[PDB]
Coordinates of C-alpha atoms and ligand atoms in Angstrom, one line a residue:
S1 CA 0.0 0.0 0.0
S2 CA 1.0 3.6 -0.7
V3 CA -0.5 4.3 2.8
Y4 CA 2.5 2.3 4.1
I5 CA 4.9 4.3 1.9
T6 CA 3.6 7.7 3.0
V7 CA 3.6 6.8 6.8
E8 CA 7.1 5.4 6.4
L9 CA 8.4 8.6 4.8
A10 CA 6.5 10.8 7.3
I11 CA 8.4 9.0 10.1
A12 CA 11.7 9.3 8.1
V13 CA 11.2 13.1 8.1
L14 CA 10.4 13.3 11.8
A15 CA 13.4 11.1 12.6
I16 CA 15.8 13.5 10.8
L17 CA 14.2 16.8 12.2
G18 CA 13.9 15.8 15.9
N19 CA 17.4 14.3 16.1
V20 CA 19.1 17.1 14.1
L21 CA 17.4 19.4 16.7
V22 CA 19.0 17.3 19.5
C23 CA 22.4 17.5 17.8
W24 CA 22.1 21.3 17.2
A25 CA 21.1 21.8 20.9
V26 CA 24.1 20.1 22.3
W27 CA 26.4 21.9 19.9
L28 CA 25.1 25.4 20.8
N29 CA 24.3 25.1 24.5
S30 CA 27.6 24.9 26.6
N31 CA 25.8 23.5 29.7
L32 CA 24.6 20.5 27.7
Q33 CA 28.1 19.4 26.9
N34 CA 28.7 16.4 29.2
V35 CA 29.5 12.7 28.7
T36 CA 25.8 11.6 29.0
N37 CA 25.0 13.8 26.0
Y38 CA 27.7 12.2 23.9
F39 CA 25.6 9.0 24.2
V40 CA 22.5 11.0 23.4
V41 CA 24.0 12.6 20.4
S42 CA 25.3 9.3 19.1
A43 CA 21.9 7.8 19.4
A44 CA 20.6 10.8 17.6
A45 CA 23.2 10.5 14.8
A46 CA 22.3 6.9 14.4
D47 CA 18.6 7.8 14.1
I48 CA 19.3 10.4 11.4
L49 CA 21.0 7.6 9.4
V50 CA 17.9 5.4 9.9
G51 CA 15.7 8.3 8.5
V52 CA 17.9 9.3 5.6
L53 CA 19.0 5.8 4.6
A54 CA 17.5 2.8 6.4
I55 CA 13.9 3.8 6.0
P56 CA 14.1 4.4 2.2
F57 CA 15.9 1.0 1.9
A58 CA 13.2 -0.7 3.9
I59 CA 10.6 0.7 1.5
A60 CA 12.5 -0.9 -1.5
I61 CA 12.5 -4.1 0.7
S62 CA 8.7 -4.0 0.2
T63 CA 8.2 -2.7 -3.3
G64 CA 9.8 -5.9 -4.7
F65 CA 12.0 -4.3 -7.4
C66 CA 14.1 -6.6 -9.7
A67 CA 17.6 -7.0 -8.4
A68 CA 20.5 -9.6 -8.1
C69 CA 20.0 -11.8 -5.0
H70 CA 23.1 -10.6 -3.1
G71 CA 22.6 -7.0 -4.1
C72 CA 19.0 -7.2 -2.7
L73 CA 20.5 -8.9 0.4
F74 CA 23.0 -6.1 0.7
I75 CA 20.2 -3.5 1.0
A76 CA 18.3 -5.6 3.6
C77 CA 21.5 -6.1 5.7
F78 CA 22.2 -2.3 5.6
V79 CA 18.7 -1.8 7.2
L80 CA 19.7 -4.2 9.9
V81 CA 23.1 -2.5 10.5
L82 CA 21.6 1.0 10.8
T83 CA 18.7 0.0 13.0
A84 CA 20.9 -2.1 15.3
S85 CA 23.3 1.0 15.8
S86 CA 20.3 3.0 16.9
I87 CA 19.4 0.3 19.4
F88 CA 22.9 -0.2 20.9
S89 CA 23.6 3.5 21.3
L90 CA 20.2 4.0 23.0
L91 CA 21.2 1.1 25.4
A92 CA 24.4 3.1 26.2
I93 CA 22.3 6.0 27.4
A94 CA 20.5 3.6 29.8
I95 CA 23.8 2.0 31.0
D96 CA 25.3 5.6 31.5
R97 CA 22.2 6.5 33.6
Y98 CA 22.5 3.3 35.7
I99 CA 26.2 4.1 36.6
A100 CA 25.1 7.7 37.4
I101 CA 22.3 6.7 39.9
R102 CA 24.0 3.6 41.4
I103 CA 27.5 5.0 41.6
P104 CA 27.2 8.8 41.7
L105 CA 30.5 9.4 43.6
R106 CA 32.6 7.6 41.0
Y107 CA 30.7 8.5 37.8
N108 CA 33.1 11.3 36.6
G109 CA 36.4 9.4 37.0
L110 CA 34.8 6.2 35.6
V111 CA 32.7 7.4 32.6
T112 CA 35.5 9.5 30.9
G113 CA 35.4 10.9 27.4
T114 CA 37.9 8.3 26.1
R115 CA 35.8 5.4 27.5
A116 CA 32.6 6.9 26.1
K117 CA 34.1 7.0 22.6
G118 CA 35.1 3.4 23.1
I119 CA 31.6 2.3 24.1
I120 CA 30.1 3.7 20.9
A121 CA 32.8 2.3 18.7
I122 CA 31.8 -1.1 20.1
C123 CA 28.1 -0.3 19.3
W124 CA 29.0 0.0 15.6
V125 CA 31.3 -3.0 15.5
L126 CA 28.4 -4.9 17.0
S127 CA 25.9 -3.5 14.5
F128 CA 28.2 -4.3 11.5
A129 CA 28.8 -7.8 12.8
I130 CA 25.2 -8.9 13.5
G131 CA 23.8 -6.9 10.5
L132 CA 26.3 -8.1 7.9
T133 CA 26.2 -11.8 9.1
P134 CA 23.7 -12.8 6.4
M135 CA 26.2 -11.6 3.8
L136 CA 28.9 -14.0 4.8
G137 CA 26.8 -17.1 3.9
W138 CA 23.7 -17.1 6.2
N139 CA 21.2 -16.2 3.4
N140 CA 18.6 -17.7 1.0
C141 CA 20.5 -16.8 -2.1
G142 CA 21.4 -20.5 -2.7
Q143 CA 17.9 -21.0 -4.2
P144 CA 16.8 -17.7 -5.9
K145 CA 13.0 -17.8 -6.7
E146 CA 13.2 -17.6 -10.5
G147 CA 9.4 -18.2 -11.0
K148 CA 8.8 -14.5 -10.1
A149 CA 11.5 -13.7 -12.7
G150 CA 8.6 -9.9 -14.6
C151 CA 12.3 -9.8 -13.7
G152 CA 15.3 -10.4 -16.0
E153 CA 17.7 -13.4 -15.9
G154 CA 19.5 -13.9 -12.6
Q155 CA 17.1 -11.5 -10.8
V156 CA 14.7 -11.8 -8.0
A157 CA 11.7 -9.9 -6.5
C158 CA 13.5 -8.1 -3.7
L159 CA 11.7 -9.1 -0.5
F160 CA 13.1 -9.2 3.0
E161 CA 11.7 -12.6 4.0
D162 CA 12.7 -14.0 0.6
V163 CA 16.5 -13.2 1.0
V164 CA 17.0 -13.0 4.8
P165 CA 16.6 -16.3 6.7
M166 CA 14.1 -16.4 9.6
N167 CA 16.4 -18.6 11.7
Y168 CA 18.9 -15.8 11.6
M169 CA 16.2 -13.2 12.4
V170 CA 14.9 -15.2 15.5
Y171 CA 18.0 -16.9 16.9
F172 CA 20.6 -14.2 16.2
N173 CA 18.9 -10.9 15.4
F174 CA 15.9 -10.8 17.7
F175 CA 18.0 -12.2 20.6
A176 CA 21.0 -10.0 20.2
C177 CA 19.4 -6.8 19.0
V178 CA 16.0 -6.6 20.7
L179 CA 15.5 -8.9 23.6
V180 CA 18.8 -8.6 25.4
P181 CA 18.9 -4.7 25.1
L182 CA 15.3 -4.6 26.2
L183 CA 15.9 -7.0 29.2
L184 CA 19.0 -4.9 30.2
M185 CA 17.1 -1.6 29.8
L186 CA 14.3 -3.1 31.9
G187 CA 16.8 -4.2 34.5
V188 CA 18.4 -0.7 34.5
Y189 CA 14.9 0.9 35.0
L190 CA 13.9 -1.4 37.9
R191 CA 17.1 -0.7 39.8
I192 CA 16.8 3.1 39.2
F193 CA 13.2 2.9 40.5
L194 CA 14.3 0.9 43.5
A195 CA 17.0 3.4 44.5
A196 CA 14.4 6.2 44.4
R197 CA 12.0 4.2 46.5
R198 CA 14.7 3.3 49.1
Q199 CA 15.8 7.0 49.2
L200 CA 12.3 8.4 49.9
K201 CA 12.0 5.7 52.7
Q202 CA 15.2 6.9 54.4
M203 CA 14.1 10.6 54.2
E204 CA 10.9 9.6 56.0
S205 CA 13.1 8.7 59.0
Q206 CA 13.8 12.4 59.0
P207 CA 17.2 12.7 60.8
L208 CA 18.0 15.9 59.0
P209 CA 15.3 15.7 57.3
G210 CA 17.5 16.3 54.2
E211 CA 18.3 18.8 51.4
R212 CA 21.3 17.1 49.8
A213 CA 19.1 14.0 49.9
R214 CA 16.2 16.2 48.6
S215 CA 17.8 16.8 45.2
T216 CA 19.2 13.2 45.0
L217 CA 15.6 12.0 45.2
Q218 CA 14.6 14.4 42.5
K219 CA 17.4 13.1 40.3
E220 CA 16.4 9.5 40.9
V221 CA 12.7 10.1 40.3
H222 CA 13.5 12.0 37.1
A223 CA 15.7 9.1 35.9
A224 CA 13.1 6.5 36.8
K225 CA 10.3 8.1 34.8
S226 CA 12.6 8.8 31.8
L227 CA 13.7 5.2 31.6
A228 CA 10.1 4.0 32.0
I229 CA 9.4 6.0 28.8
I230 CA 12.6 4.7 27.0
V231 CA 11.8 1.0 27.8
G232 CA 8.0 1.2 27.3
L233 CA 8.3 2.8 23.9
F234 CA 11.2 0.5 22.9
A235 CA 9.0 -2.5 23.8
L236 CA 6.0 -0.9 22.0
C237 CA 8.0 -0.2 18.9
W238 CA 10.3 -3.3 18.5
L239 CA 8.5 -6.2 20.1
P240 CA 5.4 -6.5 17.7
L241 CA 7.6 -7.0 14.6
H242 CA 10.0 -9.5 16.2
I243 CA 7.2 -11.5 17.8
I244 CA 5.8 -11.9 14.3
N245 CA 9.2 -13.2 13.3
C246 CA 9.0 -15.7 16.2
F247 CA 5.4 -16.4 15.1
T248 CA 6.5 -17.2 11.5
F249 CA 9.5 -19.3 12.5
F250 CA 8.7 -21.2 15.7
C251 CA 5.1 -21.8 14.6
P252 CA 5.3 -23.1 11.0
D253 CA 1.6 -24.3 11.3
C254 CA -0.5 -21.3 12.3
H255 CA 1.2 -16.3 8.7
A256 CA 0.4 -12.7 9.7
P257 CA -1.6 -10.6 7.1
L258 CA 0.0 -7.9 5.0
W259 CA -1.5 -4.8 6.7
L260 CA -0.2 -6.1 10.0
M261 CA 3.3 -6.6 8.6
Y262 CA 3.5 -2.9 7.4
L263 CA 2.2 -1.7 10.8
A264 CA 4.9 -3.6 12.6
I265 CA 7.7 -2.4 10.3
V266 CA 6.4 1.2 10.7
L267 CA 6.3 0.8 14.5
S268 CA 9.9 -0.5 14.4
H269 CA 11.1 2.7 12.7
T270 CA 9.2 5.1 14.9
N271 CA 11.6 4.2 17.8
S272 CA 14.1 6.3 15.9
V273 CA 11.9 9.4 16.2
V274 CA 10.9 9.0 19.9
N275 CA 14.2 7.5 21.3
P276 CA 16.1 9.4 22.5
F277 CA 14.2 12.6 21.6
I278 CA 11.6 12.3 24.4
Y279 CA 14.5 11.6 26.9
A280 CA 16.2 14.8 25.7
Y281 CA 12.9 16.8 25.6
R282 CA 12.4 15.9 29.3
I283 CA 15.5 17.7 30.4
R284 CA 14.6 21.4 31.0
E285 CA 18.0 22.5 29.6
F286 CA 17.3 20.7 26.3
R287 CA 13.8 22.0 26.2
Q288 CA 14.9 25.7 26.6
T289 CA 17.6 25.3 23.9
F290 CA 14.9 23.7 21.6
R291 CA 12.7 26.8 22.1
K292 CA 15.6 29.2 21.3
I293 CA 16.6 27.4 18.1
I294 CA 13.0 27.1 16.9
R295 CA 12.0 30.7 17.8
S296 CA 15.2 32.1 16.3
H297 CA 14.6 30.1 13.1
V298 CA 11.0 31.3 12.8
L299 CA 11.9 35.0 13.4
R300 CA 14.9 35.0 10.9
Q301 CA 12.5 33.4 8.3
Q302 CA 9.5 35.7 8.8
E303 CA 11.4 39.1 9.2
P304 CA 11.7 39.9 5.4
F305 CA 7.9 39.5 5.2
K306 CA 7.1 41.7 8.2
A307 CA 6.2 45.3 7.1
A308 CA 7.0 48.3 9.2
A309 CA 4.2 50.7 10.3
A310 CA 4.5 52.8 7.1
Ligands
NGI1 C1 18.2 -4.7 14.1 C2 16.7 -4.8 14.0 N1 16.3 -4.5 12.6 C3 15.1 -4.7 12.2 O1 14.2 -5.4 12.8 C4 14.7 -4.0 10.9 O2 14.7 -5.0 9.8 C5 13.5 -4.9 9.1 N2 12.7 -6.2 9.3 C6 12.8 -7.0 10.3 N3 12.0 -8.1 10.2 C7 11.3 -7.9 9.0 C8 10.3 -8.6 8.3 N4 9.9 -9.8 8.9 N5 9.8 -8.1 7.2 C9 10.3 -7.0 6.6 N6 9.8 -6.6 5.4 C10 9.1 -7.5 4.5 C11 7.6 -7.1 4.3 C12 6.9 -8.3 3.7 C13 7.4 -9.6 3.6 C14 6.7 -10.6 3.0 C15 5.4 -10.4 2.5 C16 4.6 -11.5 1.8 C17 5.1 -11.7 0.4 C18 4.0 -11.4 -0.6 O3 3.1 -12.3 -0.8 O4 4.0 -10.3 -1.2 C19 4.9 -9.1 2.6 C20 5.6 -8.0 3.2 N7 11.3 -6.3 7.2 C21 11.8 -6.7 8.4 C22 12.7 -3.7 9.6 O5 13.0 -2.6 8.7 C23 13.3 -3.4 11.0 O6 13.3 -2.0 11.2

């Protein structure tokens, strides 16, 4: 459906705009320049690449244009590399927040700029490795479906499920790229929520009653509700599609309809617009820099059209 195409491109636009806004905001505002926001900006940079490249490629993965088998496989693998990078760098934000809340005394000496650049280098090496695995031999290109070839000789209708094996999708891709990060981000959230709960408990003993503690609680509560949003949206966005993959593979009896496939693919991509944008938006310092960039842009654009009194 062209309804799928337009929704897909609408999301691609929002993915670029929101995340460019996050990258501009960190580049302009001096106060936003800390190690946490290197992770935020890396997730944002990975989201831009999803919007600019991965989403267009994922549309071609549905249109079924005629291509060589491995060339079609190449396009599908690149979707996987670019989406994985967006997941792994989002996970880095979560891990950074965990170390901030659990070990606040040692955070600065521990999460240094050199180490942060190392963590995101690993994210890409991970995304390349998992995403390009089907290219090294784990593919369906041994038996190209030539019945559908009206394609030329040695060409196939370029479909994801045609070229990418479902045992790779379920055993490797779903496990490594969705479930494990989701389980870890959930783990991180539960611990951050726990710390905040225990903190409030010990303030109720009121030995001070507390003002150093008062802000600590506010930090932990803020971090708790931010990570609830990250994880909740991540699960809402990525689980439906991958469960369908487990549906298709683990249950060869029972297949999902076409409209449902598109909806799930679209949902998978919308994680790139909301994560980590909503996390960023939730910080007041991000929100006020957003307002300044937007308002400045609108005023610089509208001023030539604004007539003086005479
Ligand atoms: C790292 C995580 N990456 C991903 O999950 C990314 O890969 C892609 N994807 C992961 N599973 C899948 C998946 N089952 N089908 C697709 N498209 C194919 C759509 C489709 C296939 C077959 C048929 C029936 C054939 C016919 O009779 O006409 C119709 C539509 N893309 C995926 C997504 O773009 C995601 O963002």
